[PDB]
Structure formats: C-alpha cells, structure tokens
Amino acid sequence: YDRGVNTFSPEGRLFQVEYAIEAIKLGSTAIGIQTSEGVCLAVEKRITSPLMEPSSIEKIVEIDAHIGCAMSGLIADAKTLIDKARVETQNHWFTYNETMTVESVTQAVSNLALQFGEEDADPGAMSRPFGVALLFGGVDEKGPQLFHMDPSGTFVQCDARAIGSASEGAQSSLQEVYHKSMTLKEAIKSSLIILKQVMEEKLNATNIELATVQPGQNFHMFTKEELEEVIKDI
Amino acid sequence: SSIGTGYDLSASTFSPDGRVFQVEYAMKAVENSSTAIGIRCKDGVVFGVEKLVLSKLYEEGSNKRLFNVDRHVGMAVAGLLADARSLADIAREEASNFRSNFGYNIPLKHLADRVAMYVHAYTLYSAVRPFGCSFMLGSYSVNDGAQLYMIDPSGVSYGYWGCAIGKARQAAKTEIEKLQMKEMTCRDIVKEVAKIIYIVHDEVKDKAFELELSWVGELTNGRHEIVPKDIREEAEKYAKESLKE
Amino acid sequence: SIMSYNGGAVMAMKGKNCVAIAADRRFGIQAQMVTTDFQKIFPMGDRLYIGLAGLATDVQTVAQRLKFRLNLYELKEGRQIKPYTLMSMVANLLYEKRFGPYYTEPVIAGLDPKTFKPFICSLDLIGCPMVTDDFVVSGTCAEQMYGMCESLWEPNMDPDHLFETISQAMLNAVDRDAVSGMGVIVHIIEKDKITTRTLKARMD
Amino acid sequence: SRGSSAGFDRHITIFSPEGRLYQVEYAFKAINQGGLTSVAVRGKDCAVIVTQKKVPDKLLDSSTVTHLFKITENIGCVMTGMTADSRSQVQRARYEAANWKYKYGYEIPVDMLCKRIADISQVYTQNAEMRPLGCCMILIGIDEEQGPQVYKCDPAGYYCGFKATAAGVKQTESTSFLEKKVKKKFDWTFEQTVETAITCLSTVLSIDFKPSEIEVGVVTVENPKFRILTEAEIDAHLVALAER
Amino acid sequence: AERGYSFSLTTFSPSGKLVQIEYALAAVAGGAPSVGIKAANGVVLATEKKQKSILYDERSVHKVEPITKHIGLVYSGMGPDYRVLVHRARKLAQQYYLVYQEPIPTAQLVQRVASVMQEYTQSGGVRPFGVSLLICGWNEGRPYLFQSDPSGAYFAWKATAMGKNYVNGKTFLEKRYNEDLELEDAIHTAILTLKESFEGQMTEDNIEVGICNEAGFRRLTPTEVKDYLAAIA
Amino acid sequence: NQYDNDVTVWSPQGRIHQIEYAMEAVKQGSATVGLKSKTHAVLVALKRAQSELAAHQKKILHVDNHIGISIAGLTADARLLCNFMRQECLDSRFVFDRPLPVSRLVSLIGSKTQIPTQRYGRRPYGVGLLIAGYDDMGPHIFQTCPSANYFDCRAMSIGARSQSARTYLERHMSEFMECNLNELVKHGLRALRETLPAEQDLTTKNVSIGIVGKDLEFTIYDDDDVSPFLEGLEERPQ
Amino acid sequence: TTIAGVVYKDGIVLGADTRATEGMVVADKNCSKIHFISPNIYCCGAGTAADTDMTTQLISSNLELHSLSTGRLPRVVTANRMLKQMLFRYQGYIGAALVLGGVDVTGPHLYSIYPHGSTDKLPYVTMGSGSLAAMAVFEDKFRPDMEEEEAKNLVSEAIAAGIFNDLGSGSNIDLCVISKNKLDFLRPYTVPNKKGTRLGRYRCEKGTTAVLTEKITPLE
Amino acid sequence: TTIMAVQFDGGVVLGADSRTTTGSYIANRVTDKLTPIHDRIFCCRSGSAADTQAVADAVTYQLGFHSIELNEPPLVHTAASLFKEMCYRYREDLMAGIIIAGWDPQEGGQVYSVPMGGMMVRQSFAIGGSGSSYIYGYVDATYREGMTKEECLQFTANALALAMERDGSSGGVIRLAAIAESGVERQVLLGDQIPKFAVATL
Ligand SMILES: *[C@](O)([C@H](C)CO)[C@H](CC(C)C)NC(=O)[C@H](Cc1ccccc1)NC(=O)[C@H](CC(C)C)NC(=O)[C@H](CCc1ccccc1)NC(=O)CN1CCOCC1
Ligand SMILES: CC(C)C[C@H](NC(=O)[C@H](CCc1ccccc1)NC(=O)CN1CCOCC1)C(=O)N[C@@H](Cc1ccccc1)C(=O)N[C@@H](CC(C)C)[C@@H](O)[C@H](C)CO
C-alpha cells in the first residue's frame, strides 16, 4: 500500500519524517559538548576496510571559522545541507559585514526541513526528507553554543548531546558526567571515553575525529598527534 | 444507494450507475452541519443561522456563518467552514471584478452563476476535491428586486423563495412553507426566521447555540447588514415564547 | 549597404534542354579582397544548383541550412527534389526570418529530375519567388547584368551558345563593378552531363 | 470478453479487453440520474423542444428552474442530465458561438456548434485526468439554406442531425414513438410539430401535463429567434389536443 | 484547476504486449466494415453507413471525409476519435502545402498522421485511438491506398477491409478481385464486398462511397450510389 | 483505510481523515494558554525538554510590535506560518503605515492554510496557533487549527492535556475582563499548571510568557524574567 | 502595383498589372498579383510582395480548412475578418494592401484591406502606387449594375491608367471575373506593352569566350 | 472626421460625416462611421480606422456574450465601459475617439464620450473628430434642453454640415441614426439634402 510523501499518520505525524528518524539510528554515533572554554565534537569513522583511506571520511566539517558541524546518518544528504550552511554564512557576511550566530545558521539549515513534496512543486524540488542528524558547535557573541537538528526540522540548544546508533547509552553516560562548568579538556576526555565505550572497534587515532571551537581559537580539527595525546590519558 | 469499490475515491471517476460519490460525500458533510435558513420577502431577504457553540471560551460572533460578499449581497453558509470562507473569497473577488469591468453592482443571478461554475469546476478532476459546503446568496435592488439563490457542492444553482441547508433541512422547509412570504415584510420575517431556527434546533443532542441574523432589502437601502441587537433580541424573545405551545 | 559589404554576382540562364548558372569568385571585405576562390554556387542534388549572392556569412548559412532541410526531405520522401519544391523550400526558409532576414538573394537553376524541363527562379531576402523563362540576376551589379541579359539572350540556345551568352553577360557586367569579379565560374548543366568552367577574367 | 475487465478500465477512460470505455457508458447512465426526459422534433418550417419541468417545491422561484438555454438569439438548446455539467456545457457553447462570430463574421451553424461541443467532449473521453460530463445537449435553429436544424451531442463525443430525437430516462420509448409517427408522413406544420412533441412526452410518461409541468422551446423560419413559450400559449396547445 | 497525468497509460505486459493498443484494435474490429480498393486509374473507399432509426439525418454527418482536394478518408472503430484524426490530418496537409506550395504526397500524410497516432500510445495520461484509417490518394500519377492502425503503424494496400468480418472480406477481395480494374469495376466489387456483411436491404443511404482518381477526391452522390446499387451500371 | 492517505478524498461519512490526522498533531506538542483582559493579551507556554541536558523548546514567537504567537505542533510548519504572518504584517506597514488588524491577519492565515486541504499531493499545516494581539478594537486571543478554521477567543488552551487548562479558564472567564496584568498572567499560569501531575509544577526553566497591550509592545519573558510572575502564586493542591 | 476591383450585376471583376520592382528597376515583367483564396474568392495583392504572397496563401489555407469542416462554400466576410485581424495584430509591419473579391450565398462582395488592418466594403476599390489613376477612371466611368464585358472594360481601363501613368506599374493586365456560377481567371487579358524587336545580332559564336579551366561530369 | 450624438427624451440621435483620408487623399468618400454594437447600442468612431474597427468588433463580441449570459438588454453604460476599458488600457497604442450612444430600458437614451485619454463621461450631447473643433461655438449657442427627436435630428444635421464645410478632413455624405425603444431609423443626407448656408459675396 503506497501513499503520498506528505501523508499524516493517525497519530499526527509525517510518515517519511519518522522513517528518516529511524534512518538516523543506523549512522555513526557522534557527541558534542558545550563548555564555557569552547565546544567539542567527536565522532567515530566506522572504517569497513583496511584499504579505505580514513582521512577521506569526514563527519566533522567547517561551516565557518567560528562554526563546525557533526553529522550522523546518510552523509550524502548532509553534504547539501553543509554547503547550504556555508553559503548562508558567506551571504550574511557579504550583506551585513558580521558573523552569523550559531542559532541563525542552525535555523537557516532547519528551514529546509519539510521542503519536500510531489504535486504543486518545482521540478528540482526534494522528493523526500534528509535522512541525517546534525550537531552545530560554535562560538558567537553569546559564547560557546551547541545545537541539535533532526529531519523534523526541530532544532534545539544542548549542553551535551549524542546522536547516532548508540544515542541512548551515550546520552545516559553524558548525563552522568556533565556539570555546567567542565573544562574543555574534561569535555574532550569524557567524549572520547563514552565513544570508546559505545564503539565496537578499538578506539585509536585513526578510528575517530575530534574538533573544537573556542572563544580565542578558530575551528580546529585535531591532528593524529593531538588525538594520540588525548587518547594517551585513556 | 451505497457503492464503494474504488468508484468513490475520485471526482474524475463515475460509478457504474452513473454517480459521482465524492460530490455526494461532500453533500453529506454539508448535511452533518448545523442548519442555516434564509427566506425572501416581498421587500428583501432575511438570513438566519443556527451557530452551534463548541465552547464557552469562544467570543460571541466567532465563526460567523454569515458573510458580506458585496455591499448589496450577503452569504449564508453550511458545512465545512474553511471551504465556505474560501468560497466567500471567490464570490467577493468575482463581484469586485464585475464592478471593475462593467461599472455597476453585480446582479445576484450572475454572481451565483459564476461562483456555481467555479464550484462545479471541482467536481471533475482527481487533482482536487469538491467543496464541502452549501451556501445561499441574498440581495435586493429596486431595478432587480428581492433575490435569493442557493448552491450545493455539485455546482447546482437555483432561485428560492425560502430555503434551508444542514441537519434539519426538511424539518425547516416544512416550517417555512407555512409562511406567506410573498406578502410579508422583512421586518415581520425576522421573527419567523428566529422561530423556525429555535423549532428546528435540537436542545438534546446539540448543546448551546448562538443565533445569527441578516438583513438585505428596501429597509436597508439595498445594503446587506447584520440585524441590530434590538430586533435580534426581540425575535429571540418571540421564538422562545413561541416554543411553549 | 549591407549587401554591398562583400559584393558578388550570381546569374542564371535558360536553354533548349539545358540550363546555366554563373557567379564571380571574389571574397572581399568592403574594398579589400581576401579570397579569389569563394564558392557561391552549391549543388542541391543532381542537375539542380543554387547560387547565393550577398553577405557571405548568410550565403554559407542559408546554403547549409537548406542542405539540412533538403537532405531530410529526400530522406523522408523516396525521391530527388523538384525545382519548384526547392524554390518553395528556400522561400519558406527565408521568410521564417521576415523581421531579421538573411542578407542574400538566392538564384535557383536546374532541370526537372523526372522530365528535363529547364527551370530558373530568384528570391527576395525574405523569400519572394520569381520564375522566369529567360534569365535571373542577383548581386551588387544587377543593373549591369540586366543590361547584358536583355541584349544577349535568345530563346532556344544550344549548350554552347548558352555558355557563350551567360559568360559574356557575367564577364562584361562584372567588369563594370568594383566589388564583383576576380574570376567567373560557369556551370552549364544538361540531362546527360554537367560542365564546369572558370573563365579568363580581369583580376583587378 | 462479453463483459470482461482488466486494470483500471472501469475507473478511468481506458480500453476494456473488448475495446469498450466503461466510464463513457457510466456517463450515459449519469444522464438518466436527473429523472427527466426531453423531446426534440423538426418540422417543415420550424423546430420544437419540449421538456419536463419537475418543480416539487413551492419554495422554488419556478422561473429559475429551466433546462432550456439560449445559446444565441437564433440558436436554442435543451440539456438533459447532471445540472451543473449541463450549465457548464451551455457556457462553453455560448463562448464557442460568440467567438465563432467574432472570428468569421457570421453566425455559427447549429451543425458546427454541435460538432465543436462534441469535439470538446472527445477529449474528456480520451484523457484520464477528467471525467466526461453526465449530460446530453440538443441544439435547434434555422440554417440559411438547409432550413430548420435539430442536432444532438453525447458524452461519448458523438453528434448528429435528426428529424427528431429524445434524451434522458424514457429516450428509447420516445424514439420508438417518434419513428412510428414519422413513417405516417403528415403535413409537418407548426402545430403538428408542437403537438407531436408534447404528445410524445405525454404518451411516454402517461401524465397529461398541466401547462406548468413542461417547458417548450421553439424556432420558426418566419421567426428565427429562439422563443420560449409562456404557460398560457402552452395551455393553448394543451387544450387544442383534447378535442380530436 | 487541472494539469494532467504525466505517466504512460500504455505499457508492456510481461509477455511483451502493448495491451491497450490491442484493446484499441478490439474496438476497431467491432465497428462498421470498410473496404478500400486501388484500381490502376483510381481508388475507392466504401463503408457501412447504417444508422439506427428513421429519425437520423444521414445527410449531416459523413464517414467518408476529404483531407484535401486529392486525399480521402474512411475508418473502422470509434466516430469521435476518427473526427479528431480527420481534423489533425487536414491541418498537417495544410502545413505541408504552406511550406512546399505542392499538394502533400499521400504516403507523407499517412506517415505524419501515423506519428500522431503513435504519440497516444506513449504520451502521458492518454489512451490510444480506437480507430483504423483507410486513406486514399492520387499523387504523381499513381493511385495510393494506405491503412493506419492504433499502434501508429501503416501499410500500403492494393485492396483491403477493416471492421466487422474483415477476414471474410479480405479473403473475398483476395479472390473476387484483382489489378487492371477500372474505377467503375472497383466501385462495383467494393459495394459487393460490402454486401458480404450487409445484414439488411442495402440502400443508397445505408452505405457511403468516395472515389479518388487523378482528377481529385470526392464523395459519391446518393444518386450515383443508387445507380451502382442496382446491381449494375 | 482507503480514505486515509489523501486530503482530496472525502469519506462516505462526509469527513476528511487527513485533516483530522493533521489536527492530532496539535495534541502532540506541549500545552499552551492564552487569555485577554480588557487592556492586555497574554500567552503562557509550557516549554518542553528532551533530556535535562537539552534546553527547552521555544514556544512563543514575535510576529509584529502588536502581535505574537504561541505554537503547538510541527515546529517547521510553525516557522513557516510565522514567517508568513510576519511578511503580511510588514506588507501592511509598508503599504498603509499602520499595523495590520489582528482579525485580518487571522483571516489571511485561514485563507492560506485552507488551500492545501483541497489539492492532491498537498497536506494541511500540522500546527495549531494561539495569537495574542492589540489594535484599536482592544486585545485579541485567536486560535488557528490545521483544518484552516479559526476562532476568536476570550480564553483558550491547546495541546497535550490542555483539557484541564480549558476547564480552569472556563470558570474564570468572568474574572478575566477586569484583572490587572499580574492577575491575568497568574490565571494563565494556573491554567497552564493544571495540565501537570502533582509531582511536577512550573519553573523558570520551563515557562515562557508573551505579553502585548495598550501600554506594552509584544515582549517575551523566558528565564530569570519569569520569576517576578511565578513568585506570587499559591502552593496548588494535590 | 495597380490593383482594382468592381462590383457589377452578376458578380465581381478584379484587375491587376504585372510589374514587380526592386529599387527603381523592373525585376519581374510578368507577376501574378491576383491570388486564389477559395474557388469563389480571389484577392489582389499590392505592397511588399512576400507579405502579400504569404498572407494570401495562409488565409487561403485556413479557409480551405474552414470549408472542409463546414462543408459549405466560404464566405467573403470570413476572409475579410481573418485578413484584417491578422494584419492588425502585426500593426502594419506586414506590407500587404489587398483587394478582396468574391461571390457568396449572400451575393457579390468587394473589400479593400489596408496593411494596418482596416477594411472598406465598397462597390469599387483601388490599391497600389497607381491607385489614384485607376480610381479616377472609376469615379469617371462607373455605374451600378454593369454588364460583365462592360465591367471588364472599365477595370482593364483603370489598370491601364495605372500602368501608363504610374512608374511603379507596367506590363500586362490580368483580370478575374467571378459570377454566381463562373470563374474566368483571364491571365494576360491584355498585353498593351511590347518589347521592341532587336535590330542587331549580338550572338557570340562558340570560341569567343576564353576558358582557363574545364571539367565535364556525366550523370544518368 | 466629425461625429456627433444628442440625447432627447425617449432616445438618442447619432450623426457622422463619411470621409476617410490617408494623407490628403480621400480613401473613402462614403464611410460608415456609425457602428452597431448591439440592437439599440451604437458607437461613433473617430481616429485610426484600424484601431476603431478592431475595438468596435471586440466590444461587440464581449457585449454580445455578456448580454447573452445575463439574458437582458445590455446597458449603454456597459458598452461604454467596455470601450472605456479597452481604450484606457491601450491608450498608448490606440488612436481612438469614440462616442457610445443608444437606448436602454433602465436609463433610457444615453450618450457617453470616450476621448483619446481613455476617460468616460455622460453628456447631454457630444461631438468628436477633427471637425468638431469648428462647431464648438455653434453647438454651444444652438443647444436647448428638451429638444424633440426631429429637433435633435435637424440639430446634428446642421452642425455636421457646418463642420464638413469648414474641415478638409471631413466631408462627403451625412449619416444619421435615430435610436429609441422603437428601434433604429438610419438615413442619409446627400447633395441638396445637406443643409446649406449663405456664403459671403461682395
Ligand atoms: C477621421 O478621423 C477624420 C476624417 C480626420 O482624420 C478619419 C475617419 C476614420 C474613422 C477612418 N480618420 C482618417 O482618415 C485616418 C488618419 C490616421 C492616420 C494615421 C494614423 C491614424 C489615423 N486615416 C487612416 O487611418 C488610413 C486608413 C486607410 C488607408 C483608408 N491610414 C493612414 O492614415 C495611415 C496610417 C498607418 C501608419 C503610418 C505610419 C506609422 C504607423 C501607422 N497613414 C499613411 O500615411 C498611409 N500610407 C503611407 C503614406 O502615404 C499614404 C499611404
Ligand atoms: C522583386 C520582387 C520579386 C520583390 C521586391 N522585393 C524587394 O524589393 C526586396 C524587399 C524586401 C523587404 C525587406 C523588409 C521590408 C520590406 C521589404 N528587396 C530585396 O530583395 C533586395 N534588396 C535589399 C537591399 O537593397 C534593396 C532591396 C518587392 O517587394 N517589390 C515590391 C515593392 C516594395 C514595397 C515595399 C518594400 C519593398 C518593395 C512590389 O513589387 N510591389 C508590387 C506589388 C506586388 C509585388 C504584390 C507593387 O506594389 C507595384 C509593382 C509597385 O512596386
């Protein structure tokens, strides 16, 4: 039995969107932590073969010099959203000569939420929701901020948040170790610990990627050596 | 009178016995709505609506089922309210365009014809569904006269002396027939309208209700206006008193 | 004038059971000559030639698009094209650009592929057809060509007298025009054969 | 075959295994839903339309209930079937006529009007997005040389000229009546035509009408303007019938 | 508001059959029979124009239609579809004439109309035509007879039949007819092969005949049909 | 089951199931209350949180200097409708240099939201709205449903367990028209808190307030700015 | 050009010269300016040659379609409407002055149609560069209900006036008589102008033309 | 050209010259400028022949369809309004001066002017065309309220005669039309029928 992509369930929800939420659960788990010293984003790479170059797996990307993004689920869908975000930030800079607040970027991307449909639509318009979940970590005038967005388009600020396959467990483990006054080192440490817990493979310097955005320093992707130096104090 | 094996899922699909069940279903949606009546006297047209109240939290005059389509044309609706409002928009725009093109107030028969054609345009394709409401257009002029028309979801338009639409359509029609509106005046008629509304109303199944009333005639210079609170309370008093016999 | 930018001359003459078509060979820009071997006559099939005078670009372009439509015609239909048919085709093609016309005045000369009946016509830049029984001219030196043709042409000419006539007409008309010349080419076509000659002409 | 079906051939306008269009036939059945019957008869110097006027309510302004429509001053029509669809087709007819006169500078022939309307119906017959109209149109009018003309068009796209026809519920009975009456060869005068029509409808319904139970359209050679008969001048024919 | 169905209503069955076209042909082989005969000096088209009552005016609608001054049409199947195809064919012919200033070759008109019919077996939201066409013409001296079926395919015929009993009519023509015939003879064997399925008194108003010689195409008058239907003349 | 999946399909009972299913989306969100005095219009919204580490969802949005809204349903549709209302208001100010009458804006919302309920492949807006506004007809509380129907209210509550709030408001309607601002916000907060089990109550972390009036443009109080309203309330019963 | 038209007792006479010019030079000495619209309707064309051609052809085609569908003989008002509406839609950019003549079921009808889309129904009309002369002949020697030969004489006289008095007109006179049951498309109705006979022999004998290159190519 | 329309009690009177010129040449010395739009609705054309003809045709079309759709005799004001809409919308592309006049069961005899601007105004009487300039004074000094039908007839006849005498772009014949509930009475004043006036001698 087939139906339209904008059909409502008797419960009052859109089938395709819910199914996209279901699609997220099969993606690599990622954790973002907000801290007055900066925001951190960590994610497992899930390398399926020794032949696969792990440096070509980026689930953490730079939206702008002050904003980075972590993604989980169908990455191919996420690429579009990332580019849209970058373009939005640059347009805003061009127009207003200032940086975008993390919330504004997150909202902008969130506006592409239910922009799908069949009839009464453009030829190039989306046929289905984006099967991906996003964590926007960045530093603006309101300091360090972390946001979460799902295919529903509902975006909300989080102090600490985990998305992906091991979402629930990692979220519990996050609740157990978060107080609104951690240092950034503590946040990174905790992130990597929970990551090591939830990952099926042995956590190493080529198994994941970690990035931080702090009030004094731009978006920084942790190199192999730095990753090792944090994994060191396991 | 009940077939439904795929033949009732579209307006672009006839039934094997030559029926368009989508339209009839929309008509059934009209039937499940509270009754609205309208009657023409020798000097105009009066509208009365049984506006059921779903909550005491709602302000008085909320969800008006009486609309001003043109300064000389009023509209009484029955059924799915949103559709009724959109249709009111269409009627308004039609009247406006007619004025802007021909230079005078649109004759009621023509407005009814146009809007009815627009309604009918929805009973033919699978891309859209028929409107879920029926409505009545009332007007008066000296060169035209007193006129009252009615349109159902199929697109059928007819001229009436008295008419009703909704739950107790027939129950109201039998009460309207008793009147001699061809000789009476819109002043006397209001009371009888309120009366028929109170009679037809079912105080048991349906809860509390508010009564809406509308003038359009020689007593209003041809303008379609709401019935003043005085005359309305007078008619309601007459109705509540006539309910004790 | 736009037509005079490149210059040139094209002529066609009728014979007994033969037909003739000639054109100068100069490709020049206003007053300077660039080439002395510029083709202005194109075969639209066996025993059917067209000759375009005017703006060189539109000469080549009209020729090419005409060959396009012609090929498609002779493919859709299992036959060679009739002269009248080709004429109407050119007329249509030119008139499609009624308000942005190609600057060329085509001249068609050939023999009916079924019969052998000679045929000569000319057209506007917007494609108005004109069929004659004697001669047709188009070019910057049209008045000179008219002058020669009105005095040299005889009715039933054999393939040798026709050659001499059209050759003298072309040569002597062209020699009184500054932007037409640098050689003359003549195609004399008959049922059996086609004879192509380049005349001895002034090159100044 | 012989009643077979496959796919959506009973839902949209596509071919059945035996090469039928079920939706079209269903539309023909939709014509009868009105529960009315119309009769058209062509005379020697006129053309006559007659139709039931079922007004079961005194609450209706009986002047607004009509199945007779003026397409042009010289072209009249009667619609049988679904009311809204009928009015739609009448609007389209009026448009095509007015546009015809605008483009060609002369009044459209009944022949050509009917042909046009039918051609429009054919599209509904061939496209699946829409459904044919549940109505049948009968046009009447005087032609400059061919004289009185009575044409009819179907939801199927069929159109034809007639000496007489009918539409609606008791169509077949009315036709069987009319051909029987035609074979006798009478002097088809005005009154002969009107009487033949009214009596066709009457003896087909067994009612014997009051002058307010039917409506009669008409068009004469001496008076080509489409004329609708008053209750009085209908009652005249009615009392003229109860004498012989 | 309306738009249209953008998907084909005619698709391939697992066996490989375009079912809707075959059903269209089923509609074709169900209408009144029509014969066509090419006869060296002309072409003849004939059809059963049997109405269904005395009330019908047979002198208003015709089954034998002219496309131009030299091309004619008859059909087997559905009337309205045929009418549409006639209008379209006439238009195509006029386009050809406007471009080339020469009357359109019969084969060309046939090919173009065939393309039009082909469209409705692939284009969105439409069914194929329930009509087979017999097209007669006189171009370049020679006479021409063509048939086009709902699939958009077309064939050249010396003689043939369509509609009810088209097989019996085809064998009949295959036997009791051949080349070198004159127009008169062809008309005769055409009304004769039409009589092989005429379940009734075949009058001059029960059938319609059109001829196409090298003097143009035209529809035979009821009088000429009466002369022919006297089993002679 | 065969009349469930398209908004252009009437049920044989004269109903449209997709519309009603869309109506069910309003009840999926956190409850919200709206009430008006004679000088002020007030929205009180119960913000909801996923986990304790996630901030509470915004429920009150600014439309114009004289108009604000409270949402209940799909946040995307809510943002859409909000941007629409904002745009219409801006248009009204650009053209007439006067603020758009609230009732007219609501009418436009009705017209816009009605359209997709009648076209194939389209869907109703999965969001309910409470609109608080002030114009020269006074304060106004309006309610808009996915069915494109709208209501002019004295008081209203929509969403999860909003029945309690409704029941509360229906008793204090008579009091509402004469209350000062603080008493009005009080009543709103009590109505809102009625939609909660006794194990939980209102907090500065999960309550938002929107206020518009004759002396005040539409303002949103979220955290520490809510305390002056909460502090001054009964202890509630069990 | 110099086209004219007249209405007599039994029908209509149309006239036209045959000179076509480009610049101040005669390009065509024999050009047919009387065009077929329908078997009962003809139309003379003056102005931009290609425009008159394509316009008259197009309207002829549309009328053929029209009569094909209607089964009747085309009316003149129809051709007039089509022509004037098309021409008006192009706001005079189609240089086509026309004389439309034909016999209907309503009788003989003669229109003049100017390239801007305006028409005049008159018993006699003239168009072209030589229209003033022809119109002078008409205004001088026209009477209602003329006989066929009389009207032919009048029209040919008018066209002649155009031919000799206007530098834009020249050569032959073409007539077209249209009655309720006849169509006389008299081509060279009169050849009042003749080229003088050659007084010499400028024939070039085979060999007088020097040749640089030759190439024979056999066909089939 | 020179058109005119005067309103009496039970209807209107229309008048026009018959000269149509291109340059200084008279392309038609016998034009029919009074064009029927409906049974009792006429219009007087001035300006571009093509423009006025096209617009008149279009308005006849529209008004015909409109009157059929309403099943009532069309208001003169409605015809004037269609003309007004067309002439105003395409004012930069049309050269048209129109006088729409006729009878109507609701308002009786009516005369409306639609000058080149595209505006519309009802008048007791209206004049237009190139010749109208020469008769403004006469028409001002001669008009009297309550004129009979025949008085209006003679009035327009005289005015048009004077204008035609003075204006070179006007002349030929005088066309008159009388419109009332009765119908349309058209007539033509030619030669000696056209009113003459004493020309100065010594
Ligand atoms: C009227 O107004 C009075 C008599 C005063 O003018 C009359 C009556 C009308 C209702 C017929 N109007 C005219 O006589 C009228 C004047 C006019 C000129 C130009 C534009 C608009 C109005 N004459 C015509 O309209 C006439 C129609 C037929 C040819 C009879 N055509 C023209 O006047 C030509 C207009 C076309 C045009 C030219 C240039 C740019 C755009 C459009 N004018 C010409 O000069 C035509 N032509 C070329 C030059 O040599 C003579 C022939
Ligand atoms: C030589 C014949 C085959 C055709 C001749 N063609 C031509 O003269 C065409 C005109 C093409 C054109 C383009 C844009 C806009 C308008 C016209 N000219 C060319 O083909 C080549 N040139 C290009 C540059 O040098 C000058 C001409 C022609 O049309 N002659 C007209 C006169 C004319 C009027 C306006 C513009 C151009 C020409 C004619 O004969 N008209 C007669 C009527 C007939 C042909 C129906 C008459 O009117 C009588 C003879 C008086 O001329």
Side-chain angles (χ1 to χ4, degrees), chain C residues 98 105 124-126, chain G residues 1 19-22 27 33 45-47 49 52 168:
Chain C
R98 170 63 175 83
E105 294 168 302
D124 265 346
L125 30 58
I126 53 181
Chain G
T1 313
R19 173 177 288 175
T21 62
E22 54 171 5
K33 302 175 181 183
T52 52

Side-chain angles (χ1 to χ4, degrees), chain E residues 128-137 141 143-161 163-174:
Chain E
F129 295 98
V131 153
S132 281
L133 297 169
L134 277 174
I135 324 186
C136 69
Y144 290 94
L145 177 68
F146 283 94
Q147 185 190 25
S148 63
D149 77 272
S151 79
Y154 66 100
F155 321 96
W157 285 103
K158 292 178 175 294
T160 186
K164 285 186 177 179
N165 275 259
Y166 72 96
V167 273
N168 290 3
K170 193 177 306 305
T171 51
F172 187 95
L173 292 174
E174 193 172 7

Side-chain angles (χ1 to χ4, degrees), chain F residues 83-95:
Chain F
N83 290 326
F84 170 77
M85 301 170 63
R86 293 175 175 177
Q87 191 55 51
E88 287 297 332
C89 289
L90 288 174
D91 289 345
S92 185
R93 289 194 185 278
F94 190 93
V95 174

